[PDB]
Amino acid sequence: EVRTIKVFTTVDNINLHTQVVDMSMTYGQQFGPTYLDGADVTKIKPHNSHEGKTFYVLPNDDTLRVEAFEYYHTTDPSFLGRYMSALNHTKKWKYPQVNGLTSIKWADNNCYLATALLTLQQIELKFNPPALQDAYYRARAGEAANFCALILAYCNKTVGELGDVRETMSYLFQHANLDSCKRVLNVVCKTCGQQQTTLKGVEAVMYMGTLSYEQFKKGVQIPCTCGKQATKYLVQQESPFVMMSAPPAQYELKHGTFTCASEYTGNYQCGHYKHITSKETLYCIDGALLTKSSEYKGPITDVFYKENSYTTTIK
Numbered sequence: 016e017v018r019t020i021k022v023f024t025t026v027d028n029i030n031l032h033t034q035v036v037d038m039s040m041t042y043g044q045q046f047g048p049t050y051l052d053g054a055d056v057t058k059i060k061p062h063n064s065h066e067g068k069t070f071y072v073l074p075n076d077d078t079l080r081v082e083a084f085e086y087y088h089t090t091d092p093s094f095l096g097r098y099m100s101a102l103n104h105t106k107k108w109k110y111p112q113v114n115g116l117t118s119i120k121w122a123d124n125n126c127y128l129a130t131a132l133l134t135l136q137q138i139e140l141k142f143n144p145p146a147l148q149d150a151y152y153r154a155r156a157g158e159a160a161n162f163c164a165l166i167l168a169y170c171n172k173t174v175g176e177l178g179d180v181r182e183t184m185s186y187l188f189q190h191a192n193l194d195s196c197k198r199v200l201n202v203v204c205k206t207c208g209q210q211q212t213t214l215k216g217v218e219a220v221m222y223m224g225t226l227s228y229e230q231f232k233k234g235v236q237i238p239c240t241c242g243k244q245a246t247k248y249l250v251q252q253e254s255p256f257v258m259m260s261a262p263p264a265q266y267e268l269k270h271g272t273f274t275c276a277s278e279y280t281g282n283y284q285c286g287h288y289k290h291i292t293s294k295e296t297l298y299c300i301d302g303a304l305l306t307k308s309s310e311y312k313g314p315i316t317d318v319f320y321k322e323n324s325y326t327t328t329i330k
């Protein structure tokens with residue numbers, strides 16, 4: 016006797032595709048790799064409780080390929096498996112509200128994710144893939160499991176792997192609309208003269224070398240091809256925020272002079288991130304943990320600043 020149930024397959028969990036499955040064969044034999052809200056059911060035969068449920072599958076026909084790319088903006092064939100594998104874990108994480116922001120209770124080396132998530136909620140940024148748009152809206156409201164799983168998938172990080180905040184923000188910014196952002200820099204060598212540069216998009220909002228937005232406006236010293244030390248300063252800026260990054264070092268954060276910052280303790284390959292936000296006082300959010308202080312000194316790696324338009328007076 017043949018028994019069947021109706022299920023739906025999906026790539027985006029919005030558009031559903033009716034399927035009738037034979038209860039005597041695995042999902043894998045009928046769809047290929049198949050997932051139920053993160054759980055890999057490829058090797059499992061259908062259960063009666065599965066009737067009417069949605070399963071994620073790979074894009075094995077052109078309708079699914081178009082749906083998958085429209086929703087995720089990626090054609091990496093291993094994306095689904097990485098997203099499903101991460102979601103199995105992030106579904107179990109806790110997402111407390113800390114000082115009005117969605118954070119992440121510490122688990123599985125996820126401090127860099129918590130810091131990035133708290134930072135996103137403090138800067139003006141809209142994502143381009145609907146998958147991130149939708150999941151970020153849910154994360155803002157406190158249901159951040161899908162957003163965190165997607166970040167891990169897009170960044171090619173597995174749960175438990177320690178990531179870098181700057182690298183993660185770089186990935187997230189590539190999937191955001193930063194097209195209006197523009198940066199003009201001037202590099203002044205005493206041997207080689209001037210050289211001005213224009214940066215756009217992600218490169219117009221990120222800098223590596225110094226944490227101070229003010230010193231960037233005054234000038235920082237960098238190598239030259241001739242062997243001398245040349246001075247680089249900010250000519251013009253057009254963006255809603257700027258990110259200043261540098262190798263971790265002792266740095267003093269003063270209330271009211273920045274938006275938020277990433278603190279990193281440890282070494283290159285093993286450590287812990289905390290988040291400092293400047294509100295009515297300085298709050299340090301460490302996953303679910305919250306402390307406050309009037310002044311801050313610590314190993315800072317990233318600082319975020321508000322911006323709209325800046326023009327130098329250094330002519």
Ligand SMILES: OCCc1ccc(O)cc1
Nearest residue numbers: 026071072083089094095
């Ligand atoms: O475009 C590939 C990304 C993807 C494919 C299938 C899914 O079910 C989910 C995501």
Ligand SMILES: [Cl-]
Nearest residue numbers: 141142148151
């Ligand atoms: Cl968005």
Ligand SMILES: [Cl-]
Nearest residue numbers: 178179182183
């Ligand atoms: Cl990383």
Ligand SMILES: [Cl-]
Nearest residue numbers: 273274320321
């Ligand atoms: Cl600021």
Ligand SMILES: [Zn+2]
Nearest residue numbers: 204207239241
């Ligand atoms: Zn030179």
